[PDB]
Every structure is written in structure tokens, then in C-alpha cells.
Design a protein around this ligand. Structure first.
Ligand code: P1C
Ligand code: P1C
Ligand code: P1C
Ligand code: FE2
Ligand code: FE2
Ligand code: FE2
Lengths: 256, 256, 256
């Protein structure tokens, strides 16, 4: 009914709880994940450090880590405030920032890839071009400081020190110790041929890690149509780029 | 001034009221349509049946007709609730559902094509690739249960058991017996070289049938620019896909 | 800190105040501009004339200058009301309208190109395909009569008879005599490799002139990524069209 399991990554990789995992994937498309290299500690360390910067970083040094266009892709954004990162072109205040945040990013990127790898394994999915080339992709990490959507990611990881639709009701998703919250996104549904649900969710700090596909991730157009994707795509295969266009879009509303 | 005519499809096909029809097309881009194979009865039959499902369908069987991504393209969506259909990949609770709804869909798809065929005939329009290949397209039917936009369809049919702009005022569009409401959309304007208005409208159950072009519907870029389309398209011809991108977009707001 | 300079175009072209201009570009991305062929008078003349049309133009003649799709690209739109223009396919009530407005448009298009030419010169930027082919582009003028965004233009010129972010605070931008307000847009940032800021701004009549790139404006994908553009573009170069798609988009919000 409206419950959300915890899975241990380690157990999934050993091949335990495979029916339960497949059933969670198909019916809910969200779960908590443990034993994935993330603690709860390290969050603290990255959090306090960037929070000090938000609170006590000088306006002059905020400038040095602000992109010239206000996209929230890298560095600082003031609207509430955000700090964003990916695998390259980062903007680090540094001294020690780069160290703590490169580590926090990398562990989340490892955890995201390894859980996506298990989603693919559990569903018998081989992406066009292979699993590895699919998962060596374009992640985006956003950390922010102070309307229902689904994600266009493969998975999205959300760390806590939030509500989602489960079984037809929007439910709260409280903290579970040393567990991260995983939302499957629309690329999971797409890549698996419909075996994975992309749940709606929304709010009511935050750390959100999107495991986003490469521009050239390629999929079958008829199979996309079958899963519920309302594609306007001529011909039999397409890319991520063809579908979403030339700028990443991270989330989507159900049409009004 | 601010009146909306009824046309009989049958009369338009006989070549009656052709100046009146052309003038409605160009100045208003909306009308009621009779004698098009739709009753008022059959609405009831599809309505009551899906409404029973909305009201009394079990959460477990709603799951079997819910797409894994919440696009409202096929099957059930809960936000108020929706049931969607097209020509293929449907999700039917069935027993008799599939029968009543396949019929309700088909008659609306027939009525939409036949009225679009008369829009094209009245305006002297031959789409690139022919009329038939244009009208053998990608319709979408949405039925829902409990801000002004124009439609990006060829026509949109709306059945009643609503306000639009006519002559510079937003007016009510009450029911007329055994008539369906037709809104011309932006593909009508585009395909006809500007001979058809795409009116703005909005709300204040619902059945909406969008007659949407194929991804490969091809048109002239300079002629599009002339009709008011603010295209960013290099070269002399383009497709629907090139214009709108790789996911259908059904409605649009005037830029804020 | 939070001040906005006036530059004289004439002085910039003579090579004066070049460090100050570069520093304004990089840190603020907005300024007032004088000595650019715009007065304050001519505004009046175009304003009063179109305002008379808004107030006293007959509904029948508003129809003759209304596009069949309500895009606000050319002619009249009623929502408050708008009058739009570009280099071709205009809709003029005329008698003398076309004269006053063709002049008001042309002087703004001259001023926009000449200031963009100085942005490019100041930053040592040679666009792929040359400066001239870049600036011979697709401008759009909107004049209207009675949420923070950045512009996707090269520059946007705004005439006054408004708030923006400067140094981390949203500030008012009062009138300065015989000066026009210039906002640099995201194409300035993109084309210059990040040397120009695209500031956020918003409201709280209006004349807005967008100097928009051609569909085929071509840029480097890795350099775009470096400047903060969250592109989903395979391969090493791309066009405006590839990035934004097949319909112009003039403004953008920072992701929510
Ligand atoms: C007839 C009509 C009405 C109406 O309210 O009556 N409008 C509605 O209620 C709308 N029908 C829809 O579901 C619009 C959502 C499509 C949107 N997700 C997109 O992809 O662009 C419009 S479409 C035409
Ligand atoms: C100068 C300025 C202002 C302003 O309010 O002053 N902002 C405005 O009022 C805006 N001008 C517009 O018409 C924006 C709508 C474009 C939008 N439909 C899209 O396609 O993306 C902006 S553009 C720059
Ligand atoms: C986990 C989660 C949450 C959440 O609130 O917790 N939602 C958020 O707060 C969202 N994270 C974002 O920054 C969304 C903005 C992306 C948007 N500009 C676009 O390009 O499409 C979502 S993404 C998943
Ligand atoms: Fe989300
Ligand atoms: Fe509509
Ligand atoms: Fe703007």
C-alpha cells in the first residue's frame, strides 16, 4: 500500500530481495538506500562548510564563484541561496571547500551510478550502447539554503539531516538514519521499457543529486510511446537531445 | 461581432455557406458543428462508464491502467482525474469499456478529420505531402472529472453535456444541442498560410479531442513567419518536430 | 557596488573608458547609454501615435493589424495591449504610423547593433562567421500599454519616459535623460566566452527592443559549458536553433 522500503545496496548487489526490488521499482519508483558509501557525517561536513560560506562568505568572494549567467549549474546562486556542482567546470571558494565538496560529490555520484546499475540489472536492461556508457553521464548536484513534479533523471538522490505519491496518496518521506532517499526518474522508465515508475513529488537545507543521461543517450521511439511518452519524433530511434532539446530540463509537471 | 455560428458538416461538404465558413475561419477560428456523427447520447454512455470507473474503480485496477510516467497520454491519471486515449497503446479497464470508448474515440476522430478536411478545402489548402497524409495523424483525447491559451492542434473538438475570445471580448460558449464545439488551432493557421485564426480560450467533466499533426508535417518557413510564427528555423522548410521539439505540446500562452 | 553607469556610445567608439566598460560588462551586465541616436523626443512621437491607436483605433482596424495567431511578434495584441515590430512582415495601421514606427524601430536597431559591436570589440570577441553576420540578425520590438528573468538576447534596449540585480541586491533603475537602458543578455555571455554578465530583472507604457541572434548563430559547446550553460548538446559546435529550439524564446527564469 503506501509504505516505502529501505534496501541495502550491498544486499541488492549480492542478489537479495530481487522480487521486492522489482516490485518497488514498478509500483512506487522510490525507496531509501543504505550501505551505499554515504553516511550522515560527511553530509554534515559539506553542509556546515558551504553554510558558513552562505552566511559568512564575502559578497566579493561570492562574485568569484558566480557564473555570468544565472543557471544554477555551477557555483553560487542567490535568489535563499544555492551551490551547484558536476564532474567538471566547478567553482570552488576553496582552501578546503574543494576537498570536502569534491568528496561529497564523488560519493553521491558513485552511489547514484551503483544504484542505477542495480535498477538496470534487476529489470534486465541493457541500454543502447551499453550500461557503462549510459552511467558515465552528466550529473548535477544542487544544495540549497534558507507543485508536484517528476524528475527527468535516471535516479535522483536526496540526502537529509518532502512528499511523494505512493499508492495514490501523497505521503511524507521522513528521515531514516544513514539512508538516502532515491526517486526514480523518467529516464529510468524510458530506458527500462516501462518497468520503472517515475513518481511525482514536491516540498512541504536541501541536497539533490540528479543522475542525468548524456545528450546522446539513444532509445527506441515506439517503445517510448508504449511506456506513455508523448513523443513527437519521426523515425525509429532518438536521442535524449532530440527528445528534450538542447538545454537540460531536470523536472516536469503533469500537463495542466 | 461577438456571435459564434453553428455549421452543419453535411452542408459544408455539399458546398453550402462557404463564404460564411471562410469568414468564420479567418475572423473567429471557432464554431459549433452539427451533423458530424456525434450525438449527445454516446457522450453519456462513455461518460457514465468512465465516471463509474473514476468513482468506483478499485485502486488496484486504476494501477493496471496507469502509465509508469505521469504524462496523461494514455489511461488513467489522478492529480480530479483524467482518462486519455489515442489510436494505439491504449489502456482499458475493459469488459465493455474498450468497446464504448473505442467507439467514442473513433467518432470524434472521424468528425475531427472531416471538419479539418473542410477547413483545408474552404481555404484552398493542399498540405505538403497531401491532405490525407496530413490528417492521418496523432490525435489525443482527454476526459477529465472533478489562464488564456491557444491550441497547437489543427482543430480541437470539445463535447458538452468555457470562454473564448471573439471580436476582442472573452465570451461564454454555452451548450448547443447535438453540436460539438470546434476551436481551430495554430496548425490550422500555419498550414493555411494564415487563413485561419487560432483563438484564445480557457475554463470558467470535460472532453477534449486534439487533432495533432505528425512529427513530420512539413511547412514553409517564410510563410510561417508571415502568419506571425516567431520561428527560429534556419532554411526554407521545416517540420512540426523542428518547430515544437521532440515532445508534443498541446497548448500555448501568449508571451507574458 | 550597486551603481549603474552611463556610457556615451560615441566615447566607447573613440576608445575611452574601455576598462570601466569591460568591468561593467563582466560585473553588472547593464548600463545606460547615451549619444546613440535616440532622443526622448522621437519616443514621444511613436508613443503618442500608437497610444492613440490603442485608445481610439477602431476594433475593425485593430483586426487588420492582428496576426491570426496570438504570438505578439507583429502588429497588435490585446490581452493591456501590445504593438510589435521587426525588420519585415510588419502590420501598420498607417497613414503616418509606418513612417513614425519604421523610424523608431530603425534607430533602435542601429543603436542595438552599434552597442553590441562595442561589447564584442571591448571583449576581443570575433563571433564564428564574423561580427557583421552576427549583428545582421532577428530583432524584435515590443511596446506595451495599460518574477525575475534574464534575457536570451545579445542586448535588450529599454526606453523610458523596473528593477535589476546589481551587486547582489535588486535595485531600481530610474530614468536618465536622453539615455537608454541596456541589459546584456545570455547571448552576450555565450558569444564572449563568459566575459559578460546576463543580469536578472523585472517590473515594479514599456518599450523593449531585443537584439536576438539568427537561428544559425554558431558557438562552441565546451566553451558554452564553461560559462555556465547547462547544454544537452552532442558534439563540439551548435547553433542557436539547436540550443533553444525552433521558436524564439526571449526570456528565462532561474530554475525553481
Ligand atoms: C477546449 C480546450 C480547453 C478547455 O479547457 O476547454 N483547454 C483545456 O482544458 C486544455 N486541455 C488540456 O489538457 C491542456 C494541457 C496540455 C499541456 N499539458 C501541454 O502539453 O501543452 C485546453 S485545449 C482546448
Ligand atoms: C527590459 C525587459 C523587461 C522589462 O520588464 O523591462 N522584461 C519584460 O517586460 C519582458 N519583455 C517581454 O515581452 C517578455 C516576454 C517573452 C516571452 N514570451 C518568451 O518568449 O520568452 C522582459 S525583456 C527585458
Ligand atoms: C528531490 C527533488 C526535489 C525536492 O524538492 O526534493 N525537487 C526539488 O526541490 C527540485 N530540484 C531542483 O532544483 C529543480 C529545478 C530544475 C528546473 N530548473 C528544470 O530545469 O527543469 C526537485 S528534483 C527531486
Ligand atoms: Fe523531483
Ligand atoms: Fe485550448
Ligand atoms: Fe528582461
Amino acid at each position: 500500500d503506501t509504505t516505502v522500503p529501505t534496501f541495502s545496496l550491498a544486499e541488492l548487489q549480492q542478489g537479495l530481495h530481487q522480487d521486492e526490488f522489482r516490485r518497488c521499482l514498478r509500483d512506487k519508483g522510490l525507496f531509501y538506500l543504505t550501505d551505499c558509501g554515504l553516511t550522515d557525517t560527511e553530509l554534515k561536513s559539506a553542509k556546515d562548510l558551504v553554510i558558513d560560506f552562505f552566511e559568512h562568505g564575502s559578497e566579493a568572494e561570492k562574485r568569484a564563484v558566480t557564473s555570468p549567467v544565472p543557471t544554477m549549474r555551477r557555483g553560487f546562486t542567490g535568489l535563499s541561496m544555492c551551490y551547484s556542482m558536476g564532474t567538471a567546470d566547478n567553482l570552488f571558494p576553496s582552501g578546503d571547500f574543494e576537498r570536502i565538496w569534491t568528496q561529497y560529490f564523488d560519493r553521491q555520484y558513485t552511489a547514484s551510478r551503483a544504484v542505477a546499475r542495480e535498477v538496470l540489472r534487476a529489470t534486465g536492461t541493457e541500454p543502447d550502447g551499453g550500461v557503462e556508457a549510459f552511467l558515465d553521464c552528466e550529473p548535477l548536484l544542487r544544495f540549497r539554503y534558507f507543485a508536484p513534479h517528476y524528475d527527468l533523471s535516471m535516479v535522483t538522490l536526496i540526502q537529509q539531516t518532502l512528499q511523494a505519491e505512493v499508492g495514490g496518496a501523497f505521503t511524507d518521506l521522513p528521515y531514516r538514519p544513514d539512508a538516502v532517499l532515491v526517486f526514480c526518474g523518467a529516464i529510468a522508465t524510458l530506458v527500462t521499457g516501462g518497468q520503472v515508475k517515475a513518481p511525482r513529488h514536491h516540498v512541504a537545507t536541501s541536497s539533490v543529486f540528479f543522475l542525468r543521461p548524456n545528450a546522446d543517450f539513444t532509445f527506441s521511439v515506439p517503445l517510448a510511446r508504449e511506456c506513455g511518452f508523448d513523443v513527437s519524433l519521426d523515425g525509429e530511434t532518438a536521442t535524449f537531445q532530440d527528445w528534450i532539446g538542447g538545454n537540460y530540463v531536470n523536472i516536469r509537471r503533469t500537463s495542466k
